[PDB]
Symmetry: D2
């Protein structure tokens, strides 16, 4: 069975229950809702469908709300026509959202473009298709020198590598998309363009402002500042999504795999889920097979140690959504199966539980948990055993779906430590994960508040 | 505080309570009754007094009954006079108990002296004072050549180094001594001259026949057969007693330390106490200080890893019983304090507990136990932590006194695993062995019959 | 300084000396000649220029001759027009090179298509684009079931995975390329489409037949067969080139990274250079910057542990040959720099030399070597020190260019072990790789025929 | 073959060549000359005989001159008659060399007895036979209370446990003894009663004053001050002699084994031989068999790690000198055979050499050495391999007998590193310590002054 979990963005080709059900089947574990597009009724029905499928089949899934977040865009061109920039030329950016640009100038949606930039700074346009150098700044104008030939279209993304931008943490719309999220009760929010811990807290404050206080916040690392503030961001969030594509636009190429690796490792050490994201099977938006280069990159994320892998357009609008979920899974299964535990108070207990589980060959580790901490603490060592996580918190069951190799199970009550061992035993067996005569290792907390894992116990089924 | 336990033989100079009380204070932990001498009323008062002091002070101790054992002795001499044997001479042993010997021959109490011996065999007499070689066996006669000059007194101990003797496991007085042992409820019986598992089983059966089935049997290895059968002996015993002295007459001197070593190591591995015994502070039978040679010997037995050290004549009849108890304990304390854990299902759990105890610096390990198994399973690793051992079994409480660094405590009930943690926490504190904020590691068995230790939990006081 | 070495394929845009010089400068260590194209006089001049640059600058490089190898093509179609085949359809292959095919069958260049195939076998066409089932073979005809929809273009590769083809190993045109190679004295021959150890030997026998017995043979694993016979291939060759692209055609995607990994690992253990090859910075054939996916793929090859990385079209015919050498190198330097030694008779000595070098902090390991084995043997552990390799064999010095982090140096004589230490100290200093006061670890063979490394010696500069 | 070396004191019953030859044969490796007795002619003939046996048999031995050292002694008594002291009594010591003592007072040979002592201090007399408490010091008088009954004989040794004494490093007769030592070319001097480094230097200076600069100095630690200054003593000495018995009168008994342990461990770490000495087989002064306690104590000293063991009286005047040598060696052979290497620039080189010897199973390590350092450095790790040590220095060959498991061999020249491997191979073979096909590890120094071991080489015979 794979352990690495797969997050799929759901779109209109993939939203029916029927599809939903086909996807959980091929390996889907979380549904992602990309608020870059769609309205609240579409999303709602999507949430509802999933939830339907869920109730109908007994499968579990989780629901991740992706915010759209702050951005700087170029706007419109003459006659809606493309313009050819030429290396060396001068090109100029205007804050005047009224201007209609041409081959010499264009407007930008971001009234602060002037202040945040600085002569010498680089401007990149259309996910890096064109780069320019800033020569001068005056009035509403940024004047640059195009450093390379390319066609500027209408409404294009601008990157300001190394630059810190004064956009706020939450775009405007952004705020209403989280309220919605709270109202529907999503299990995670993936917040875009995080650059500093201050940005996390703002998102937590909104959530908490709307009853979304138990919603896990996944900060998306997408540029250099964020990369820089990684540690403090990480400390404030419940987890991370490394966006290779965005990073590869903001920072030196040779540094992007190293950033992924690093972030991945700090997550696992912090007990915070991490998602590996942009540019996974993108060729499948158009083909029914990924390329070899693509297969190795995902493999290598799994090997880097991620908890989950994510499909974007491959599953939202491509022509083979189910073919991607399916190859995405054989690759997880196959990568996962050649990985090893990493042994190298919660910690002591949990490493011991894992080390023991392995020494006794137990196929299963059973953990009791309120917040999900102890299922994460065991997953920190990359057990060979599957983790059967019992909990009475619904949210916690949902959120554990995202964790590597955990199988959450919602229970009505856990009266006591021996009560857990009994129940854990029943379930072990009920789960077809183990059979009479297997050793099982059961971890939980005893006379300690949630957040402390201090007890390990070996049992024979 | 020392960990190594002290076994003291009680004699008529040490039997008063007052004494008993000054000895428990100096470090005695178990009182040995040597049934080589004394009658049942003496011994009984002895037990009674000890049990007195115990109830009067709240101290705990254990009682070990030492059997006297089968033996081969030489018998009487003309006029009760000693005869000087001379190297080179012919000398002869006769199984004819009626014979009254002289410088040419003497009788032996052991009818099988001529069948078990063989031409070429060595006979030793009077604790190795004189040796001889067997040249011929015929009729009731064993004819030797005296290898060395010496004087043969009457009624002396004979050693048949390397020979297997068909004396029985037990002697006619040995059997009454154990029934007495049973009526009095001693905690352990140290059986003498054990040579083969069969001997153990006989002992076990005799005890079981008289309600003594819960008495721990300690086999005394005193000769080469025993040594050879170590492994099946150990398997059948609840423990061992290494009698260096005897060993030293029966086997090559250079092997004796090695025997002691080996045997201590296999006891600890098997979870069976072991006692290091003859020749420990014997000089103190006459002096109030042991000799430096002597001190190293004990120290070294502690370092070889023994649970206990045993005082003989030094405390039963010597002039300085309480000086010997006291120098024995400073040595214990001083050696014990420079030792280290040896980490290298029950086992996995216990090693981890100890291993975790040390990583979190816990001064105490608290164990629940019926039989004593789990307290011994944790001592296997020579913890730095004291072991606080809770049990509802009184016998168990007593026998655990003999175990290295265990403090046993009798409780009225342990209703459940959470119950134990609460209970063990109160006592940990109550015992002044830890204080508020110390980490304590609690071990027990959860949903498993006695004899399985499968649970470890860390708690802060 | 980077360690991982860079093989660059030289073409007509890159062959000047001027260029050659600018590339050595950017990181090129080996020139690859792609015999898929060009003639003997172009090649010869290429070799000669490289050799000029070398002699003029003192730089060292090595020269790798790639053979072209055996193939199986589909041929021409009606009007040069594509024809779309549809699943379930019957389609068929003819050996008759005169047929002009259409939607129902085409011609293949390999007369033995019929005998080597077998009803039930799979035929793959066009780098796997379309697959078919062997239904029938009769006459000059192999008849199959198209298993998937696609369009057959003209002149398309065919793969017969699992099947052994009777094509010889060395194409009788190819044979000519090796002779040339021997006359010019290339350092390595990379042999195409190796499937089995018998294929290696065939190459070796040709080389030996023409004075090229000292030329290292790199087998290119490019298919399932080869993959399967990897071990016996490895044993017969002097090294390997893992051709991910070809592999990805013949075998299941999700296995392709795993094959690379494996193969890299058994190389290093065997002391046989390994190159990682197709699909490295291909985008740069057209852009001056690779993609972030490409940059992690290389990195990851370096992390998998390859000795070298190779540029194909990026440096032979693309628009930015020197931009690819150069990003290729920053990526090497960058990856190389965060890697660690792998410690985990030649073996014992060399492991030790490395472990010692690291404990003493030596910036450099000096090795004496005839065949190169002792430089590879130290390189097996990924030392942090640079390897300075002395040798009197010219071929040895050239081929060591291809080894990870080795700096070869040709010397006139090494009279004795003490002579080596003296010489090796001079050169260490002469090299600016160490300075007065650094520890240096010197490894060599003493009173042993080449092929044994038995001597290690530490010295201060 | 035993590794532990045996130091035998040579007296008049053992000085004949015949005897010397029989002992070399039982295991004697060094001859000790105890200058507490004999005159120069006796000793010289003793040296001569041993040297004879040597030359006659090709055996090697070393010679060790034991200084008598300074002392405090009680002097004469009225009529030469013993006086019984009674506990509680007052008894007084006088500095006045003229007094003739009785039961109330006696004189001491040590003028500083009054200054160095203090009220409260303990004075022991006649090897601890009697102890007394100092109550008052006045004039030439030290007044005490006898703590125990006993009889005072004349001319008896006194201990001031815990006291520092201003006796000089050396006695007047000690000085003449060393001059003789130097004339005879003894190999080691064991200096008695070393308390502080200053003492070692004194000894060194006198030796140096008389051509004895190459004689190794072995400090004897006999008292608490000694013990306290251990480290600086060690540093100055070429080695140590642990005098357990002396220690045992000067310091708490329970510290004495720990003293031995510690000092044996710091000698091995410092590459300085150590000798375990008083109280080894003393009972054999009178019997032909040691006691079991005795045998454990030695074995245990070999296990603590000493390089040598020493016979005293047992081999100088006892009745069974050759039985004591002989049991001393069985015990050595038997304890030594169950030990293991301890692996845990000279160092690095040497640990690896041993580590490699074991991994390749080499039965011998051959070392080149001027001063003996590298032989000691390999021995530091308790190799299972014998050390064959080639040197050109005869003193060095001699002193190396004293080291654990080294076989020293005097050679005429070692021209070069390869020369060494050649030679070492011949001799390895010539020594019947190895055979064709055995791996041998050869260690030395290459292009480094003596005192640096930087080269290790593996060879097959």
């Amino acid at each position: 069975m794979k352990k690495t979990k797969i997050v799929c963005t759901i779109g209109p080709k993939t939203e029916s229950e029927e599809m939903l059900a086909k996807m959980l089947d091929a390996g889907m574990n979380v549904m992602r809702l990309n608020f870059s597009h769609g309205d609240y009724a579409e999303h709602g029905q999507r949430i509802q469908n999933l939830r339907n499928v869920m109730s109908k089949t007994g499968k579990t899934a989780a629901i991740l709300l992706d915010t759209k977040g702050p951005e700087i865009r170029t706007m419109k061109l003459e006659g809606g026509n493309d313009v050819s920039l030429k290396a060396g030329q001068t090109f100029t950016f205007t804050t005047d959202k009224s201007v209609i640009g041409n081959s010499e100038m264009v407007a930008v949606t971001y009234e602060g473009f002037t202040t945040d930039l600085s002569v010498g700074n680089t401007v990149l346009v259309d996910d890096g298709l064109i780069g320019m150098e800033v020569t001068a700044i005056e009035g509403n104008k940024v004047i640059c020198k195009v450093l390379n030939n390319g066609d500027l279209g209408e409404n294009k993304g601008v990157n300001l590598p190394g630059v810190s931008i004064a956009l706020p943490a939450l775009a405007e719309k952004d705020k209403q998309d989280l309220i919605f999220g709270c109202e529907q009760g999503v299990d995670f929010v993936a917040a875009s363009f995080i650059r500093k811990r201050s940005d996390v807290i703002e998102i937590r404050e909104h959530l908490k402002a709307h009853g979304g206080e138990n919603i896990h916040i996944i900060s998306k690392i997408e540029n250099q500042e964020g990369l820089n503030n990684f540690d403090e961001i990480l400390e404030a969030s419940d987890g991370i999504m490394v966006a290779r594509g965005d990073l590869g636009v903001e920072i030196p190429v040779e540094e992007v795999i190293f950033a992924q690796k690093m972030m991945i490792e700090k997550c696992i050490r912090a007990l915070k889920v991490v998602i590996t994201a942009t540019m996974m099977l993108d060729s499948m938006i158009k083909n029914p097979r990924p390329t070899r280069a693509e297969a190795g990159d995902v493999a290598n994320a799994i090997l880097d140690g991620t908890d989950a892998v994510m499909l974007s357009g491959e599953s939202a609008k491509g022509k083979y959504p189910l073919e991607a979920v399916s190859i995405m899974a054989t690759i997880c299964e196959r990568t996962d199966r050649v990985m090893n535990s990493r042994l190298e108070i919660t910690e002591a207990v949990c490493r011991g539980a894992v080390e023991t589980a392995e020494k006794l060959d137990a196929p299963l580790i059973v953990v009791a948990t309120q917040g999900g901490k102890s299922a994460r603490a065991v997953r920190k060592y990359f057990p060979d055993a599957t983790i059967l996580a019992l909990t009475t918190n619904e949210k916690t069951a949902h959120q554990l779906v995202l964790s590597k190799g955990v199988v959450p199970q919602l229970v009505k009550e856990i009266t006591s430590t021996d009560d857990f061992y009994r129940l854990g035993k029943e379930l072990a067996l009920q789960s077809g994960l183990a059979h009479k005569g297997d050793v099982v290792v059961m971890v939980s907390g005893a006379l300690v508040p949630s957040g402390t894992t201090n007890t390990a116990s070996v049992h024979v089924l």
